[PDB]
Amino acid sequence: GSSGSSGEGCYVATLEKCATCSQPILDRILRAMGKAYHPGCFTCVVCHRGLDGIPFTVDATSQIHCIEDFHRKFASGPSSG
């Protein structure tokens, strides 16, 4: 099994780079968490659902967790740490 693929993306023209796939946004730029991401890349880490137009919450791990999940993971009873 061979694995190799370069990423032709060095130059930049008044465009933001997706903080998910590391690609230059040209079609549409979705502002989230201060940074810029693709309107399709932005998704949950657990359920992996599109959060393009819905509330969410992140953590130290930087793993955007949809309110629901976050409420089912973090809010799963008495926890501390």
Enumerate binding residues for Zn ion (CB under 5 A): 18, 20-21, 38, 41, 44, 46-47, 66, 69
Nearest CA among 32, 26, 35, 28 for reference residue 44: 32
Q: How far is the CB of 1 from Zn ion (least distance, A)?
A: 25
Residue 4 vs 35, nearer CB to Zn ion = 35
Residue 1 vs 55, nearer CB to Zn ion = 55
Residue 32 vs 77, nearer CB to Zn ion = 32
Q: 36 φ, ψ to 5°?
A: -110, 130
Question: Quick one: which H or E segment has residue 57?
Answer: strand 56-57
Q: How far is the CB of 37 from Zn ion (least distance, A)?
A: 6
CA distance 29 to 71: 28
